Design an enzyme around this catalytic site. Structure first.
Site, PDB file in Angstrom:
ATOM      1  N   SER A 203       0.804  -1.258   0.130  1.00 29.32           N
ATOM      2  CA  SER A 203      -0.033  -0.117   0.111  1.00 29.32           C
ATOM      3  C   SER A 203       1.029   1.311   0.050  1.00 29.32           C
ATOM      4  O   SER A 203       1.451   1.611  -0.926  1.00 29.32           O
ATOM      5  CB  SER A 203      -0.985  -0.184   1.215  1.00 29.32           C
ATOM      6  OG  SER A 203      -1.875   1.092   1.132  1.00 29.32           O
ATOM      7  N   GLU A 329      -9.114  -5.325  -3.887  1.00 26.68           N
ATOM      8  CA  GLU A 329      -8.273  -3.745  -3.397  1.00 26.68           C
ATOM      9  C   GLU A 329      -9.247  -2.878  -2.747  1.00 26.68           C
ATOM     10  O   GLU A 329      -8.943  -2.570  -1.687  1.00 26.68           O
ATOM     11  CB  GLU A 329      -7.480  -3.404  -4.461  1.00 26.68           C
ATOM     12  CG  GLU A 329      -6.359  -4.371  -5.059  1.00 26.68           C
ATOM     13  CD  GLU A 329      -5.301  -4.270  -4.014  1.00 26.68           C
ATOM     14  OE1 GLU A 329      -5.287  -3.696  -2.860  1.00 26.68           O
ATOM     15  OE2 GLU A 329      -4.194  -4.962  -4.272  1.00 26.68           O
ATOM     16  N   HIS A 442      -7.699  -5.404   0.869  1.00 28.62           N
ATOM     17  CA  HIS A 442      -6.354  -4.661   0.817  1.00 28.62           C
ATOM     18  C   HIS A 442      -5.449  -4.973   2.112  1.00 28.62           C
ATOM     19  O   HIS A 442      -5.981  -4.633   3.174  1.00 28.62           O
ATOM     20  CB  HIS A 442      -6.796  -3.244   0.784  1.00 28.62           C
ATOM     21  CG  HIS A 442      -5.508  -2.307   0.582  1.00 28.62           C
ATOM     22  ND1 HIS A 442      -4.897  -2.224  -0.757  1.00 28.62           N
ATOM     23  CD2 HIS A 442      -5.135  -1.240   1.327  1.00 28.62           C
ATOM     24  CE1 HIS A 442      -3.877  -1.284  -0.564  1.00 28.62           C
ATOM     25  NE2 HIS A 442      -3.887  -0.758   0.699  1.00 28.62           N
TER      26      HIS A 442
HETATM   27  N1  LIG Z   1     -12.032  10.889  13.186  1.00 23.60           N
HETATM   28  C1  LIG Z   1     -11.949  10.922  11.720  1.00 23.60           C
HETATM   29  C2  LIG Z   1     -12.392  12.035  11.177  1.00 23.60           C
HETATM   30  C3  LIG Z   1     -12.374  11.997   9.616  1.00 23.60           C
HETATM   31  C4  LIG Z   1     -12.034  10.624   8.796  1.00 23.60           C
HETATM   32  C5  LIG Z   1     -11.872   9.560   9.795  1.00 23.60           C
HETATM   33  C6  LIG Z   1     -11.892   9.775  11.159  1.00 23.60           C
HETATM   34  C7  LIG Z   1     -11.759   8.109   8.986  1.00 23.60           C
HETATM   35  C8  LIG Z   1     -11.170   7.124   9.930  1.00 23.60           C
HETATM   36  C9  LIG Z   1     -12.236   5.990  10.257  1.00 23.60           C
HETATM   37  C10 LIG Z   1     -12.020   5.076  11.022  1.00 23.60           C
HETATM   38  C11 LIG Z   1     -10.729   4.705  11.257  1.00 23.60           C
HETATM   39  C12 LIG Z   1      -9.659   5.587  10.893  1.00 23.60           C
HETATM   40  C13 LIG Z   1      -9.814   6.925   9.987  1.00 23.60           C
HETATM   41  N2  LIG Z   1     -11.546   8.062   7.726  1.00 23.60           N
HETATM   42  C14 LIG Z   1     -11.514   6.887   6.951  1.00 23.60           C
HETATM   43  C15 LIG Z   1      -9.967   6.444   6.612  1.00 23.60           C
HETATM   44  C16 LIG Z   1      -9.835   5.024   5.962  1.00 23.60           C
HETATM   45  C17 LIG Z   1      -8.530   4.785   5.960  1.00 23.60           C
HETATM   46  C18 LIG Z   1      -8.256   3.337   5.440  1.00 23.60           C
HETATM   47  C19 LIG Z   1      -6.670   2.954   5.489  1.00 23.60           C
HETATM   48  C20 LIG Z   1      -5.790   3.024   4.412  1.00 23.60           C
HETATM   49  N3  LIG Z   1      -4.757   2.709   4.818  1.00 23.60           N
HETATM   50  N4  LIG Z   1      -4.853   2.438   6.267  1.00 23.60           N
HETATM   51  N5  LIG Z   1      -6.085   2.672   6.692  1.00 23.60           N
HETATM   52  C21 LIG Z   1      -6.289   2.162   8.063  1.00 23.60           C
HETATM   53  C22 LIG Z   1      -5.429   1.495   8.537  1.00 23.60           C
HETATM   54  N6  LIG Z   1      -5.726  -0.148   8.382  1.00 23.60           N
HETATM   55  C23 LIG Z   1      -5.742  -1.030   7.466  1.00 23.60           C
HETATM   56  C24 LIG Z   1      -4.295  -1.217   6.861  1.00 23.60           C
HETATM   57  C25 LIG Z   1      -4.520  -2.021   5.640  1.00 23.60           C
HETATM   58  N7  LIG Z   1      -5.461  -2.770   5.155  1.00 23.60           N
HETATM   59  C26 LIG Z   1      -6.409  -2.756   5.900  1.00 23.60           C
HETATM   60  C27 LIG Z   1      -7.355  -3.595   5.811  1.00 23.60           C
HETATM   61  C28 LIG Z   1      -8.613  -3.457   6.404  1.00 23.60           C
HETATM   62  C29 LIG Z   1      -8.829  -2.619   7.585  1.00 23.60           C
HETATM   63  C30 LIG Z   1      -7.880  -1.888   7.740  1.00 23.60           C
HETATM   64  C31 LIG Z   1      -6.661  -1.643   7.064  1.00 23.60           C
HETATM   65  C32 LIG Z   1      -3.185  -2.268   4.720  1.00 23.60           C
HETATM   66  C33 LIG Z   1      -2.028  -1.468   4.975  1.00 23.60           C
HETATM   67  C34 LIG Z   1      -1.786  -1.183   6.446  1.00 23.60           C
HETATM   68  C35 LIG Z   1      -2.976  -0.443   7.010  1.00 23.60           C
HETATM   69  C36 LIG Z   1     -11.835   9.133   6.907  1.00 23.60           C
HETATM   70  C37 LIG Z   1     -11.791   9.192   5.517  1.00 23.60           C
HETATM   71  C38 LIG Z   1     -11.978  10.401   4.802  1.00 23.60           C
HETATM   72  N8  LIG Z   1     -11.928  10.141   3.387  1.00 23.60           N
HETATM   73  C39 LIG Z   1     -12.131  11.596   5.518  1.00 23.60           C
HETATM   74  C40 LIG Z   1     -12.209  11.698   6.690  1.00 23.60           C
HETATM   75  C41 LIG Z   1     -12.112  10.623   7.495  1.00 23.60           C
END
Ligand SMILES: Nc1ccc2c(c1)c(-c1ccccc1)[n+](CCCCCc1cnnn1CCNc1c3c(nc4ccccc14)CCCC3)c1cc(N)ccc21
Ligand SMILES: Nc1ccc2c(c1)c(-c1ccccc1)[n+](CCCCCc1cnnn1CCNc1c3c(nc4ccccc14)CCCC3)c1cc(N)ccc21
Ligand SMILES: *[C@@H]1O[C@H](CO)[C@@H](O)[C@H](O)[C@H]1NC(C)=O
Lengths: 536, 531
Positions: A203, A329, A442
């Protein structure tokens, strides 16, 4: 000294270290965890490039993982392994520039190929200490020297006021580069071959590997590369100098920081780490998915031009790359962000919900570009079918952000002299807690490449243990020779290199290797050739 | 004197000819006048009904073919010559033909009216492929075919002028439909069961009779083979018709509308035919100079607006396409293509061909066409590029306008039946790469394989019999299915939900879903948005 295990005492440029003997299923491994590679990037050093770690006196204890870089902890689904497995497993601190080394036990007698792992987490999260990144299996079973490092994430690693002295951007990539520099100088003390270093990441980690390929001062620090479900090119891995300037100024306003860049950065430096984490997501220009606030900037320094310009004009004759994707993905990115999607229901969506999702999934798309996406992904035989619409939404996000940027990178590297090997990982872990509709999400190939199924306490099937062993062999044979194929094993199906003529890639699943042609060729011609012309 | 060959129609007495068909005799009444000869001052004018005659009019031979451009591209070549006039060219051409069983039917019989193709610039009802004798003999049908004015003679328009209003060739067709209503009962035909059938420009003509209220009372059912009223070639705007007629006038030395039209009327027929092709706005293929005009009269609005807003509850429609609609259109017009070589083209030649094949397309629209039709696994493969070029032309001009018509008629109350004809005649002289070209299903529907002197296979004879049964069962009932065959597979009606059509080939009927669904979503939904 004199009463301790002599196999666990090593000296590096900075001083003496004491490691730990770990148990792996097949036997012991040597681990040197939490080795400092830089001066703690705290106080006046926040947003600044890393400084090499000054030498220490006495024996530094390297038996435990160190602090995780300051980041946003996922609390969406409390107690859920699906989300918790990616969360920090050590204390959060700005003092986080530490690396880990795993080697066979006893340490190898002759120089051994080194694998350097660069974790993902949208450049806002991640740690080298997570259980999925455990180097003990690769070190034990394959005899590999495995290195993983912590690099600054979020505002700490990528907030930039391009052109400034105090916050120039890409400092998280410089943390990575400094750990690559540390490997060159010190890995020989562990029995590692500095002349055979393979970078591997997934990633944001794969996009980081890609940025080391495209940045000249990094090219001298490695010989081969593995980009898993991520690329330097694409819609999310970078931002322009203008966009990074905009996002850093908005965050400064949000935390009460006001007129030159020195004043603004000094004020940001007085703010507690959590104040910055609390406002991180609020700087994104649209309602989006697969978009991160503070990512590598096209500065004209680390990145001399956009990764798109760099991959189209570069000479990659001397390079060997292993690239690939997972079956689904985009599926995970839909659960937080797209209305109608949930991990707790089958997520059968309506046409309205699909059209709405395409605007979130392709946020930079105009009304015409979004219509071209909708018309391409609709099944005009069943245009209202909820299962098709649900899957089409996953495919839009997957294809736009990963598969087609990967196809574009493979095509360009192969055309410009590299040896490319491409794959598709299609095996869904028997132990997965995400719903079935999500398929192979992913990051769920990592546990297999690292050899986690080999631990009997993790409850994977016998098939999954044989499959993990197979994958560990592909990766380490690639690190050893630049070819994933076993030279002794004539019988096993060969993995042909990816070429622009034949477009060959393999399927990685419980069945023997299968050679397929064209990585999502018609669909990626749409994303990579047509859609850029619909920005005119 | 055979009493089965003397018919009294409203204009007077006629005498037909007893013709031999493989299975027995048929009655033929050929070259019946249905209008006043459209000559001299009547050139470009709507047709006038034929004045009555004295004595017995001889109707034993085909009459003159309407004045048109004769194809001299490949002299002696069956492939092109089979479509050329087989009677003398004349402006005095408004004649129709009738084929009925022998003896004439005892009870009223369903009537099939054939409207020929030829890009509205060519064609004749006298061609061997339009021979009604097989359908009349084997199926007991009353078959009618008419000549209508083509080219400048039938479609040169100065919209709003009284002396050249446009669509006069469609009015020639309407007058023959009026003639059928008034006189077909004298032949044993049922005026209350009239099915129109046509191919290419003939199918577009059939479609225009569906979309024009005064025609709707003259027929009950319709067959549109490889042509539609909607689409890029079947019509022009009043503005476009005006510039083309003005340009042609300039080309022949002419000279307000009255003045311009009077000068055009003094010109010999061949002078107009000689400049016909020189009025087209671009280098194009599947584009014709003088075609039906959207006049606000015959066509109250564009066929697109008419098909999108019309109520077709009372209508039964049989629509379809051939396997390779566009292949023929590539031989004259696209560089790299020939009937005498395998036509393996380069990528450059393909991009160049897309500009000729989609002449209205902008640089972006043409790029979207190229990127959609390229096989990104083999993007430089000459066979793929050759075949993709055929598909661009066939899809843009026929398949997707057909899909659009079927979808709109079905959604707005019609009973629709759709097909794809995939059989390549064993007797075909066009190269194999051309596959099943535009118009090569006609000889099968008309039942030509039933004549043993035409050297078709036994399989082709059984297949022609099958097709003649689909068409006549559709004319009889509005359903091409045989109630006799209490066996499978049934031909389902085409619906917007299921999108069912059948394959017409030597194998039993096969039900397929979605007529090039993804590709036609590109042409019918995306491409119009550019711009
Ligand atoms: N308080 C607040 C305010 C605004 C926003 C948010 C939270 C969050 C949020 C919600 C829950 C947890 C973390 C963040 N997101 C969602 C963000 C989506 C992130 C997804 C991602 C992309 N890369 N890593 N991660 C999270 C880390 N975990 C993972 C990782 C990987 N795979 C995964 C597969 C499933 C579940 C989690 C995985 C592969 C690589 C390592 C990290 C937002 C998204 C957007 N676009 C705008 C605002 C917010
Ligand atoms: N002197 C001069 C000056 C400029 C141009 C031309 C000639 C010709 C031309 C060449 C040969 C014969 C007739 C016209 N064409 C090419 C026009 C091609 C028309 C194709 C067509 C479309 N509908 N009927 N036809 C011709 C009639 N024959 C056929 C017909 C059908 N199928 C066929 C299948 C294969 C071969 C012929 C068939 C089904 C319907 C009946 C007519 C031009 C095309 C363009 N775009 C511009 C200028 C000229
Ligand atoms: C799934 O759950 C979400 C949130 O509760 C909801 O918006 C969505 O409509 C649900 N879908 C189905 C198919 O039940």
């Amino acid at each position: 000294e004199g009463r301790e295990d002599p196999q666990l005492l090593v000296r590096v440029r900075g001083g003496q270290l004491r490691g730990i003997r770990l148990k792996a299923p097949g036997g012991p491994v040597s681990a040197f965890l939490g080795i400092p590679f830089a001066e703690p990037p705290v106080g006046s050093r926040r947003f600044m490039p890393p400084e090499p770690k000054r030498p220490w006196s006495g024996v530094l204890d390297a038996t435990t993982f160190q602090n995780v870089c300051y980041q946003y902890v996922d609390t969406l689904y409390p107690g859920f392994e699906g989300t918790e497995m990616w969360n920090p497993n050590r204390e959060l601190s700005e003092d986080c520039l530490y690396l880990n080394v795993w080697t066979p036990y006893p340490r190898p007698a002759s120089p051994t190929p080194v694998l350097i792992w660069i974790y993902g987490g949208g450049f806002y999260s991640g740690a080298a200490s997570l259980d999925v990144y455990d180097g003990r299996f690769l070190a034990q079973v394959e005899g590999a020297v495995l290195v993983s490092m912590n690099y600054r994430v979020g505002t700490f690693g990528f907030l930039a006021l391009p052109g400034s002295r105090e916050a120039p951007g890409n400092v998280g990539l410089l943390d990575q580069r400094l750990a690559l520099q540390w490997v060159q100088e010190n890995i020989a003390a562990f029995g590692g071959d500095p002349m055979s270093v393979t970078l591997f990441g997934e990633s944001a980690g794969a996009a980081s590997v890609g940025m080391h390929i495209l940045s000249l001062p990094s090219r001298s620090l490695f010989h081969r590369a593995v980009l898993q479900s991520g690329t330097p090119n694409g819609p999310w891995a970078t931002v322009s100098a203008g966009e990074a300037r905009r996002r850093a100024t908005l965050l400064a306003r949000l935390v009460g920081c006001p007129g030159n860049d020195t004043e603004l950065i000094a004020c940001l430096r007085t703010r507690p780490a959590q104040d910055l984490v609390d406002h991180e997501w609020h700087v994104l220009p649209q309602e989006s998915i697969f978009r991160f606030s503070f990512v590598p900037v096209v500065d004209g320094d680390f990145l001399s031009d956009t990764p798109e310009a760099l991959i189209n004009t570069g000479d990659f004759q001397d390079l060997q790359v292993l690239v690939g994707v997972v079956k689904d993905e985009g599926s995970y990115f839909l659960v937080y962000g797209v209305p109608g999607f949930s991990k707790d229901n089958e997520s059968l969506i309506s046409r309205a919900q699909f059209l709405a999702g395409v605007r979130i999934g392709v946020p930079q798309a105009s009304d015409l570009a979004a219509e071209a996406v909708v018309l391409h992904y609709t099944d005009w035989l069943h245009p209202e079918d909820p299962t098709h619409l649900r899957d089409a939404m996953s495919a839009v996000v997957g294809d736009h952000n990963v598969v087609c940027p990967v196809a574009q990178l493979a095509g360009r590297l192969a055309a410009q002299g590299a040896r490319v090997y491409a794959y598709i990982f299609e095996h869904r872990a028997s132990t997965l807690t995400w719903p079935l509709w999500m398929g192979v999400p992913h990051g769920y190939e990592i546990e297999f490449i690292f050899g986690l199924p080999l631990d009997p306490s993790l409850n994977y099937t016998t098939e999954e243990r044989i499959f993990a062993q197979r994958l560990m062999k592909y990766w380490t044979n690639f690190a050893r020779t630049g070819d994933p194929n076993d030279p002794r094993d004539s019988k096993s199906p060969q993995w042909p290199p990816y070429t622009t003529a034949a477009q060959q890639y393999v399927s990685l699943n419980l069945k023997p290797l299968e050679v397929r042609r064209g990585l999502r060729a018609q669909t990626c011609a749409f994303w990579n050739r047509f859609l850029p012309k619909l920005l005119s």
